[PDB]
mmCIF file of C-alpha atoms and ligand atoms in Angstrom:
data_model
loop_
_atom_site.group_PDB
_atom_site.id
_atom_site.type_symbol
_atom_site.label_atom_id
_atom_site.label_comp_id
_atom_site.label_asym_id
_atom_site.label_seq_id
_atom_site.Cartn_x
_atom_site.Cartn_y
_atom_site.Cartn_z
ATOM 1 C CA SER A 1 -24.819 8.801 -10.969
ATOM 2 C CA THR A 2 -21.584 8.898 -13.139
ATOM 3 C CA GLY A 3 -19.855 11.605 -14.690
ATOM 4 C CA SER A 4 -17.716 11.404 -18.153
ATOM 5 C CA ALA A 5 -14.700 14.779 -19.038
ATOM 6 C CA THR A 6 -12.526 14.391 -21.803
ATOM 7 C CA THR A 7 -8.504 15.165 -21.572
ATOM 8 C CA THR A 8 -5.923 16.531 -23.809
ATOM 9 C CA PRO A 9 -2.469 16.315 -24.052
ATOM 10 C CA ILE A 10 -1.136 20.134 -22.571
ATOM 11 C CA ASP A 11 1.730 20.238 -25.209
ATOM 12 C CA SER A 12 2.316 17.834 -28.375
ATOM 13 C CA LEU A 13 4.251 15.746 -26.223
ATOM 14 C CA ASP A 14 1.362 14.783 -23.675
ATOM 15 C CA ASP A 15 3.594 15.954 -21.358
ATOM 16 C CA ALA A 16 0.271 15.992 -18.837
ATOM 17 C CA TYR A 17 -3.316 15.968 -19.629
ATOM 18 C CA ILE A 18 -5.321 18.676 -18.453
ATOM 19 C CA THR A 19 -9.750 17.808 -17.812
ATOM 20 C CA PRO A 20 -12.117 21.379 -17.641
ATOM 21 C CA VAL A 21 -13.409 21.230 -13.754
ATOM 22 C CA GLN A 22 -16.320 23.076 -12.940
ATOM 23 C CA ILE A 23 -15.849 24.815 -9.028
ATOM 24 C CA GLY A 24 -18.248 26.925 -7.749
ATOM 25 C CA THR A 25 -21.574 28.948 -8.077
ATOM 26 C CA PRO A 26 -21.789 30.132 -10.943
ATOM 27 C CA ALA A 27 -19.170 27.754 -12.139
ATOM 28 C CA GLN A 28 -16.154 28.619 -12.851
ATOM 29 C CA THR A 29 -14.013 26.266 -15.022
ATOM 30 C CA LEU A 30 -10.333 25.255 -14.456
ATOM 31 C CA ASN A 31 -8.515 22.740 -16.368
ATOM 32 C CA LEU A 32 -6.862 20.322 -13.545
ATOM 33 C CA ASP A 33 -4.537 17.805 -14.111
ATOM 34 C CA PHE A 34 -6.124 14.551 -12.671
ATOM 35 C CA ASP A 35 -3.254 12.609 -10.179
ATOM 36 C CA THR A 36 -4.071 9.396 -9.180
ATOM 37 C CA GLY A 37 -0.636 10.166 -7.610
ATOM 38 C CA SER A 38 -2.006 12.026 -5.075
ATOM 39 C CA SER A 39 -5.131 12.760 -2.756
ATOM 40 C CA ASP A 40 -4.784 16.817 -3.267
ATOM 41 C CA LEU A 41 -7.111 18.497 -5.473
ATOM 42 C CA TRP A 42 -5.913 22.557 -5.232
ATOM 43 C CA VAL A 43 -6.363 25.288 -7.537
ATOM 44 C CA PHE A 44 -4.395 29.319 -8.749
ATOM 45 C CA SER A 45 -6.607 31.477 -7.497
ATOM 46 C CA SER A 46 -7.482 34.559 -6.033
ATOM 47 C CA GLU A 47 -4.964 34.531 -3.521
ATOM 48 C CA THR A 48 -2.225 32.955 -5.221
ATOM 49 C CA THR A 49 1.020 35.878 -4.879
ATOM 50 C CA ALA A 50 0.364 37.276 -8.154
ATOM 51 C CA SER A 51 4.084 37.245 -9.517
ATOM 52 C CA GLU A 52 3.465 33.361 -9.166
ATOM 53 C CA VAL A 53 0.458 33.470 -11.796
ATOM 54 C CA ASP A 54 1.103 33.390 -15.367
ATOM 55 C CA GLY A 55 -1.739 32.871 -17.579
ATOM 56 C CA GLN A 56 -3.654 30.058 -15.321
ATOM 57 C CA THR A 57 -7.012 30.706 -15.122
ATOM 58 C CA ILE A 58 -7.582 30.984 -10.949
ATOM 59 C CA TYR A 59 -10.675 30.240 -8.652
ATOM 60 C CA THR A 60 -11.684 33.273 -6.679
ATOM 61 C CA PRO A 61 -14.268 31.866 -4.227
ATOM 62 C CA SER A 62 -15.513 35.410 -3.546
ATOM 63 C CA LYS A 63 -17.144 35.336 -5.716
ATOM 64 C CA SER A 64 -19.652 31.864 -5.663
ATOM 65 C CA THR A 65 -22.074 31.887 -3.118
ATOM 66 C CA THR A 66 -21.745 28.552 -2.725
ATOM 67 C CA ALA A 67 -17.615 28.730 -1.271
ATOM 68 C CA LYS A 68 -17.126 28.558 2.135
ATOM 69 C CA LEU A 69 -13.759 29.412 4.327
ATOM 70 C CA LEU A 70 -12.795 26.395 6.295
ATOM 71 C CA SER A 71 -11.378 27.739 9.070
ATOM 72 C CA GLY A 72 -8.085 27.289 9.926
ATOM 73 C CA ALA A 73 -7.135 24.806 7.141
ATOM 74 C CA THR A 74 -4.006 25.137 5.768
ATOM 75 C CA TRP A 75 -2.437 22.725 3.297
ATOM 76 C CA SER A 76 1.308 21.754 2.025
ATOM 77 C CA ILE A 77 2.133 19.346 -0.642
ATOM 78 C CA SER A 78 5.668 18.693 -2.803
ATOM 79 C CA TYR A 79 5.716 16.476 -5.405
ATOM 80 C CA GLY A 80 8.360 14.085 -6.865
ATOM 81 C CA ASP A 81 9.772 16.541 -9.314
ATOM 82 C CA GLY A 82 10.805 18.899 -6.982
ATOM 83 C CA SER A 83 7.453 21.065 -7.562
ATOM 84 C CA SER A 84 5.508 22.370 -4.570
ATOM 85 C CA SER A 85 2.243 24.422 -3.480
ATOM 86 C CA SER A 86 0.508 25.313 -0.115
ATOM 87 C CA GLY A 87 -2.664 27.334 1.193
ATOM 88 C CA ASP A 88 -6.164 27.626 2.952
ATOM 89 C CA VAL A 89 -8.834 25.586 1.926
ATOM 90 C CA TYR A 90 -12.325 25.947 0.851
ATOM 91 C CA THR A 91 -15.711 23.765 0.571
ATOM 92 C CA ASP A 92 -17.308 24.860 -2.718
ATOM 93 C CA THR A 93 -19.403 22.583 -4.804
ATOM 94 C CA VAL A 94 -17.306 20.817 -7.586
ATOM 95 C CA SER A 95 -18.220 19.233 -10.918
ATOM 96 C CA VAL A 96 -16.626 16.887 -13.543
ATOM 97 C CA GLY A 97 -17.955 15.743 -16.871
ATOM 98 C CA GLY A 98 -21.883 16.282 -15.348
ATOM 99 C CA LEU A 99 -20.719 14.340 -11.551
ATOM 100 C CA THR A 100 -21.136 16.520 -8.755
ATOM 101 C CA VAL A 101 -19.813 16.807 -5.681
ATOM 102 C CA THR A 102 -21.305 19.160 -2.762
ATOM 103 C CA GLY A 103 -18.759 20.422 0.348
ATOM 104 C CA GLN A 104 -16.064 20.066 -1.499
ATOM 105 C CA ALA A 105 -12.215 20.449 -0.600
ATOM 106 C CA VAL A 106 -10.894 22.750 -3.177
ATOM 107 C CA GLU A 107 -7.550 23.769 -1.440
ATOM 108 C CA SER A 108 -6.680 27.603 -2.814
ATOM 109 C CA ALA A 109 -2.719 28.398 -3.612
ATOM 110 C CA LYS A 110 -1.352 31.217 -1.863
ATOM 111 C CA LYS A 111 2.079 29.662 -3.030
ATOM 112 C CA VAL A 112 3.230 27.785 -6.248
ATOM 113 C CA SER A 113 7.063 26.970 -6.961
ATOM 114 C CA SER A 114 8.460 28.169 -10.519
ATOM 115 C CA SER A 115 7.218 25.073 -12.518
ATOM 116 C CA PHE A 116 3.553 25.949 -11.582
ATOM 117 C CA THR A 117 4.284 29.698 -12.279
ATOM 118 C CA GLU A 118 5.884 28.691 -15.952
ATOM 119 C CA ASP A 119 3.621 26.111 -17.255
ATOM 120 C CA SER A 120 0.376 28.355 -17.984
ATOM 121 C CA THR A 121 -1.853 25.502 -18.652
ATOM 122 C CA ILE A 122 -2.860 23.968 -15.617
ATOM 123 C CA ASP A 123 -4.635 25.785 -13.315
ATOM 124 C CA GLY A 124 -4.214 22.981 -10.250
ATOM 125 C CA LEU A 125 -4.826 19.603 -9.677
ATOM 126 C CA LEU A 126 -7.064 17.120 -8.502
ATOM 127 C CA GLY A 127 -5.957 14.013 -6.748
ATOM 128 C CA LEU A 128 -7.615 10.605 -7.413
ATOM 129 C CA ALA A 129 -4.546 8.624 -4.941
ATOM 130 C CA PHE A 130 -6.233 7.333 -1.461
ATOM 131 C CA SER A 131 -7.371 10.193 1.000
ATOM 132 C CA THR A 132 -4.832 9.011 3.458
ATOM 133 C CA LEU A 133 -2.289 11.306 1.545
ATOM 134 C CA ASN A 134 -4.580 14.571 1.713
ATOM 135 C CA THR A 135 -2.339 17.163 3.007
ATOM 136 C CA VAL A 136 -4.571 19.366 4.936
ATOM 137 C CA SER A 137 -4.284 20.359 7.792
ATOM 138 C CA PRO A 138 -5.569 19.758 11.082
ATOM 139 C CA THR A 139 -8.089 18.014 9.268
ATOM 140 C CA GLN A 140 -7.657 15.514 6.910
ATOM 141 C CA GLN A 141 -10.367 16.022 3.609
ATOM 142 C CA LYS A 142 -11.664 13.593 1.108
ATOM 143 C CA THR A 143 -10.551 13.531 -2.354
ATOM 144 C CA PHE A 144 -13.252 13.904 -4.937
ATOM 145 C CA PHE A 145 -13.472 10.324 -6.007
ATOM 146 C CA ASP A 146 -14.107 9.301 -2.092
ATOM 147 C CA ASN A 147 -16.650 11.644 -1.377
ATOM 148 C CA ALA A 148 -18.517 11.068 -4.804
ATOM 149 C CA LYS A 149 -18.149 7.465 -3.981
ATOM 150 C CA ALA A 150 -21.347 6.033 -2.363
ATOM 151 C CA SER A 151 -23.737 8.254 -5.293
ATOM 152 C CA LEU A 152 -21.851 6.495 -7.975
ATOM 153 C CA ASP A 153 -23.606 3.904 -10.193
ATOM 154 C CA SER A 154 -20.135 1.772 -9.737
ATOM 155 C CA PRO A 155 -17.707 2.760 -7.381
ATOM 156 C CA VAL A 156 -14.632 2.720 -10.229
ATOM 157 C CA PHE A 157 -13.288 5.687 -12.697
ATOM 158 C CA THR A 158 -11.244 5.348 -15.732
ATOM 159 C CA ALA A 159 -8.460 6.448 -17.353
ATOM 160 C CA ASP A 160 -8.125 5.936 -21.021
ATOM 161 C CA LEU A 161 -5.718 8.490 -22.055
ATOM 162 C CA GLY A 162 -4.805 9.042 -25.777
ATOM 163 C CA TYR A 163 -1.696 9.371 -27.300
ATOM 164 C CA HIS A 164 -1.389 12.350 -28.809
ATOM 165 C CA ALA A 165 -4.796 13.247 -28.755
ATOM 166 C CA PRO A 166 -7.970 13.417 -26.634
ATOM 167 C CA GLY A 167 -8.848 10.935 -23.351
ATOM 168 C CA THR A 168 -11.427 10.019 -21.398
ATOM 169 C CA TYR A 169 -11.994 9.655 -17.397
ATOM 170 C CA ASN A 170 -15.533 8.083 -16.462
ATOM 171 C CA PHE A 171 -16.287 7.904 -13.104
ATOM 172 C CA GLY A 172 -18.543 5.496 -11.915
ATOM 173 C CA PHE A 173 -19.085 3.339 -14.749
ATOM 174 C CA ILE A 174 -16.939 1.433 -17.789
ATOM 175 C CA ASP A 175 -17.129 2.181 -20.714
ATOM 176 C CA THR A 176 -17.449 -1.779 -22.745
ATOM 177 C CA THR A 177 -16.529 0.477 -25.910
ATOM 178 C CA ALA A 178 -13.519 2.087 -25.207
ATOM 179 C CA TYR A 179 -11.586 -1.125 -25.192
ATOM 180 C CA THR A 180 -10.336 -4.786 -26.778
ATOM 181 C CA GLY A 181 -11.015 -7.788 -25.432
ATOM 182 C CA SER A 182 -11.165 -8.724 -21.528
ATOM 183 C CA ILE A 183 -9.990 -6.321 -18.268
ATOM 184 C CA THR A 184 -7.640 -8.463 -16.518
ATOM 185 C CA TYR A 185 -7.803 -7.160 -12.567
ATOM 186 C CA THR A 186 -4.757 -7.440 -10.347
ATOM 187 C CA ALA A 187 -4.142 -6.576 -6.687
ATOM 188 C CA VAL A 188 -3.888 -3.206 -4.753
ATOM 189 C CA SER A 189 -1.582 -2.587 -1.856
ATOM 190 C CA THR A 190 -3.270 0.439 -0.342
ATOM 191 C CA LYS A 191 -0.352 0.579 2.359
ATOM 192 C CA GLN A 192 1.138 3.421 0.675
ATOM 193 C CA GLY A 193 -1.598 5.858 -0.928
ATOM 194 C CA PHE A 194 -1.373 4.414 -3.392
ATOM 195 C CA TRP A 195 -2.830 2.689 -6.455
ATOM 196 C CA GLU A 196 0.029 0.623 -5.640
ATOM 197 C CA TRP A 197 0.190 -2.935 -7.836
ATOM 198 C CA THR A 198 2.395 -5.402 -8.803
ATOM 199 C CA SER A 199 2.723 -6.593 -12.898
ATOM 200 C CA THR A 200 3.865 -9.847 -13.874
ATOM 201 C CA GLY A 201 6.610 -8.473 -16.134
ATOM 202 C CA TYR A 202 8.120 -7.691 -19.703
ATOM 203 C CA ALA A 203 8.950 -7.928 -22.760
ATOM 204 C CA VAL A 204 11.838 -5.232 -25.047
ATOM 205 C CA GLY A 205 9.694 -5.360 -28.880
ATOM 206 C CA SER A 206 9.493 -8.383 -30.808
ATOM 207 C CA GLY A 207 12.129 -10.357 -27.420
ATOM 208 C CA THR A 208 10.603 -13.021 -25.321
ATOM 209 C CA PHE A 209 8.850 -11.939 -21.975
ATOM 210 C CA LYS A 210 10.854 -12.200 -18.482
ATOM 211 C CA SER A 211 8.554 -13.082 -15.986
ATOM 212 C CA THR A 212 9.431 -11.352 -12.879
ATOM 213 C CA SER A 213 7.935 -9.263 -10.211
ATOM 214 C CA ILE A 214 7.757 -5.443 -10.486
ATOM 215 C CA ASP A 215 5.634 -3.525 -7.718
ATOM 216 C CA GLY A 216 4.600 -0.129 -8.360
ATOM 217 C CA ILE A 217 2.505 2.546 -8.714
ATOM 218 C CA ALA A 218 -0.576 3.744 -11.789
ATOM 219 C CA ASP A 219 0.408 7.687 -11.122
ATOM 220 C CA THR A 220 -1.834 9.948 -14.174
ATOM 221 C CA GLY A 221 0.222 12.667 -12.644
ATOM 222 C CA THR A 222 3.846 11.058 -13.559
ATOM 223 C CA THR A 223 4.824 11.817 -17.739
ATOM 224 C CA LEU A 224 7.017 8.467 -17.855
ATOM 225 C CA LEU A 225 7.451 4.973 -17.458
ATOM 226 C CA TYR A 226 9.734 4.500 -14.197
ATOM 227 C CA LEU A 227 11.864 0.869 -13.633
ATOM 228 C CA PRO A 228 14.633 -0.665 -12.052
ATOM 229 C CA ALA A 229 17.538 0.055 -13.663
ATOM 230 C CA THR A 230 18.058 -3.397 -14.965
ATOM 231 C CA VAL A 231 14.753 -3.379 -16.495
ATOM 232 C CA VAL A 232 15.372 0.051 -18.171
ATOM 233 C CA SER A 233 18.588 -0.828 -19.754
ATOM 234 C CA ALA A 234 17.546 -4.209 -21.611
ATOM 235 C CA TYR A 235 14.969 -1.674 -23.021
ATOM 236 C CA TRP A 236 17.592 0.612 -24.454
ATOM 237 C CA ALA A 237 20.167 -2.016 -24.665
ATOM 238 C CA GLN A 238 18.449 -2.516 -27.664
ATOM 239 C CA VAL A 239 18.807 1.208 -29.580
ATOM 240 C CA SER A 240 21.707 1.718 -31.373
ATOM 241 C CA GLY A 241 23.602 4.758 -29.615
ATOM 242 C CA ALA A 242 21.535 5.110 -26.580
ATOM 243 C CA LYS A 243 22.980 5.729 -23.137
ATOM 244 C CA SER A 244 22.640 7.608 -19.787
ATOM 245 C CA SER A 245 23.080 11.178 -19.025
ATOM 246 C CA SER A 246 23.929 12.355 -15.659
ATOM 247 C CA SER A 247 23.857 16.413 -17.270
ATOM 248 C CA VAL A 248 20.910 15.640 -19.130
ATOM 249 C CA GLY A 249 18.948 13.309 -16.543
ATOM 250 C CA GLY A 250 18.360 10.143 -17.714
ATOM 251 C CA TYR A 251 18.290 7.629 -20.904
ATOM 252 C CA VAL A 252 18.598 9.873 -23.918
ATOM 253 C CA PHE A 253 18.868 8.336 -27.878
ATOM 254 C CA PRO A 254 19.411 9.949 -31.598
ATOM 255 C CA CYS A 255 16.291 11.150 -32.865
ATOM 256 C CA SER A 256 16.761 9.050 -36.359
ATOM 257 C CA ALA A 257 16.359 6.439 -34.077
ATOM 258 C CA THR A 258 13.532 3.984 -34.563
ATOM 259 C CA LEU A 259 11.993 2.745 -30.922
ATOM 260 C CA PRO A 260 11.243 -0.411 -30.087
ATOM 261 C CA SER A 261 8.144 -1.367 -28.030
ATOM 262 C CA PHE A 262 7.615 -2.210 -24.490
ATOM 263 C CA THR A 263 5.190 -5.211 -22.873
ATOM 264 C CA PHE A 264 4.139 -4.783 -19.733
ATOM 265 C CA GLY A 265 2.597 -7.910 -18.007
ATOM 266 C CA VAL A 266 -0.667 -7.393 -15.789
ATOM 267 C CA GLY A 267 -1.412 -11.534 -14.278
ATOM 268 C CA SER A 268 -1.555 -13.159 -17.521
ATOM 269 C CA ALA A 269 -2.617 -10.386 -19.655
ATOM 270 C CA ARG A 270 0.344 -8.320 -22.029
ATOM 271 C CA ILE A 271 0.144 -4.357 -21.965
ATOM 272 C CA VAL A 272 2.214 -3.129 -25.264
ATOM 273 C CA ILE A 273 3.574 0.471 -25.370
ATOM 274 C CA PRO A 274 4.512 1.349 -29.002
ATOM 275 C CA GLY A 275 7.590 2.622 -29.329
ATOM 276 C CA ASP A 276 7.147 5.740 -30.792
ATOM 277 C CA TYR A 277 4.760 6.604 -27.037
ATOM 278 C CA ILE A 278 8.528 6.082 -26.089
ATOM 279 C CA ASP A 279 9.798 9.380 -27.618
ATOM 280 C CA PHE A 280 9.472 12.702 -25.653
ATOM 281 C CA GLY A 281 12.258 14.814 -28.607
ATOM 282 C CA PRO A 282 14.574 16.902 -28.443
ATOM 283 C CA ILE A 283 16.275 17.322 -24.953
ATOM 284 C CA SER A 284 16.542 21.171 -26.409
ATOM 285 C CA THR A 285 14.940 23.095 -29.210
ATOM 286 C CA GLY A 286 17.072 21.587 -32.493
ATOM 287 C CA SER A 287 18.875 18.901 -30.730
ATOM 288 C CA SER A 288 19.261 15.384 -32.546
ATOM 289 C CA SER A 289 19.210 13.630 -28.894
ATOM 290 C CA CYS A 290 15.946 12.893 -27.960
ATOM 291 C CA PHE A 291 14.384 11.902 -24.816
ATOM 292 C CA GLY A 292 13.340 8.395 -23.212
ATOM 293 C CA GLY A 293 10.097 7.866 -21.838
ATOM 294 C CA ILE A 294 11.369 4.989 -19.833
ATOM 295 C CA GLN A 295 13.462 5.908 -17.362
ATOM 296 C CA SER A 296 14.969 4.364 -13.941
ATOM 297 C CA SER A 297 13.167 4.112 -10.909
ATOM 298 C CA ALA A 298 16.912 4.351 -8.872
ATOM 299 C CA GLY A 299 16.823 7.573 -7.513
ATOM 300 C CA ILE A 300 12.723 7.481 -6.303
ATOM 301 C CA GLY A 301 12.010 4.357 -4.540
ATOM 302 C CA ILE A 302 9.594 3.647 -6.394
ATOM 303 C CA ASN A 303 8.474 2.489 -10.078
ATOM 304 C CA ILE A 304 5.920 4.655 -11.643
ATOM 305 C CA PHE A 305 3.584 3.561 -14.383
ATOM 306 C CA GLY A 306 3.245 7.037 -15.383
ATOM 307 C CA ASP A 307 1.264 7.991 -18.583
ATOM 308 C CA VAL A 308 3.420 6.864 -21.108
ATOM 309 C CA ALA A 309 2.336 2.737 -19.717
ATOM 310 C CA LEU A 310 -1.276 3.890 -19.218
ATOM 311 C CA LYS A 311 -2.016 5.459 -22.249
ATOM 312 C CA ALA A 312 -1.414 2.570 -23.710
ATOM 313 C CA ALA A 313 -4.556 0.859 -21.559
ATOM 314 C CA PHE A 314 -7.976 1.547 -20.033
ATOM 315 C CA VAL A 315 -7.383 1.649 -16.979
ATOM 316 C CA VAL A 316 -10.003 0.825 -14.573
ATOM 317 C CA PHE A 317 -9.392 2.085 -10.095
ATOM 318 C CA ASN A 318 -11.692 0.133 -8.718
ATOM 319 C CA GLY A 319 -12.709 1.597 -5.008
ATOM 320 C CA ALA A 320 -14.878 -0.946 -4.002
ATOM 321 C CA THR A 321 -14.252 -1.681 -0.187
ATOM 322 C CA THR A 322 -10.838 -4.055 -1.431
ATOM 323 C CA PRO A 323 -9.857 -1.909 -4.023
ATOM 324 C CA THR A 324 -8.348 -3.232 -7.758
ATOM 325 C CA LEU A 325 -6.737 -2.230 -10.928
ATOM 326 C CA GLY A 326 -7.952 -3.493 -14.504
ATOM 327 C CA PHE A 327 -6.006 -2.949 -17.563
ATOM 328 C CA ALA A 328 -7.293 -3.490 -21.048
ATOM 329 C CA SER A 329 -6.343 -3.224 -24.628
ATOM 330 C CA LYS A 330 -7.152 -1.019 -26.427
HETATM 331 C C1 463 B 401 5.267 21.845 -12.366
HETATM 332 C C2 463 B 401 4.096 20.361 -12.265
HETATM 333 O O1 463 B 401 3.016 20.737 -12.628
HETATM 334 N N1 463 B 401 4.453 19.583 -11.407
HETATM 335 C C3 463 B 401 3.480 17.889 -11.004
HETATM 336 C C4 463 B 401 2.128 17.730 -11.804
HETATM 337 C C5 463 B 401 1.398 16.848 -11.699
HETATM 338 C C6 463 B 401 2.215 16.031 -10.357
HETATM 339 C C7 463 B 401 3.044 15.664 -10.628
HETATM 340 C C8 463 B 401 3.968 14.934 -9.547
HETATM 341 N N2 463 B 401 3.849 13.879 -10.610
HETATM 342 C C9 463 B 401 4.006 17.070 -10.726
#
């Protein structure tokens, strides 16, 4: 089997992407944030504290004839931005782009933090990291991909995120029309539960390529590109007036700037992120100070190839017995 679904930016900045997901019988369609940096499929629901729901579409398990309470199971998760959610668990039928999994753990939120409430466009998350990170207790649950894998034509999914435009998540096949040139595959460590790999270096604008190993994760659920402070300083040094602002929480630059591209290495291959992808717009409405799309990972503990990087590529998440990642230009 295969599946194919369109993923759409939630706003004009590509702050996140939402993908429609069918849950239950009859189908309830929710728009979920597909997140290769986590491993829980959780949703706003009829159980979510009422004051914490503001415009999201909710899953109502009592209206699904295939929903079953997973007795005794609970979940609780915290994310890198300080947000969090928790609740109980149902199993139900879940379909993405025509690919159906029966008995999928659907984690129903009883509580969500303010940032989730405040974002009316995201109805929940669909985790696509390794199932070892799943938070359900006392019995850990599998991701949608892990559950689907054995049925897929090939044990893979692909992310093809758009810049200020829709893109595609495919399951079970590689669309050879969706990229240019070849796909370069690189080793993955699953030791931390992530799609963790090592980039071979970087270049800023038209500058020379610096060969250096940068370990990081391919994370569709993170907006920006988080890299070592040395790399990030080298980038922003090429933008007149750019500086790190502790009050804003990262590098900012004059909105009048033209940003240089940023290249990252995948083996001997190179992925070029155009400068415009690195502009996240005014820091507050009407400001002439703009927020940068490349930021330091120093406070985080891990480098993160978030949407800024991934959207510049066609990315293969190869879930074969020894997983790997593939990157192509597009
Ligand atoms: C408030 C909100 O939507 N946070 C979120 C979503 C998806 C992933 C992560 C972690 N990178 C955080």
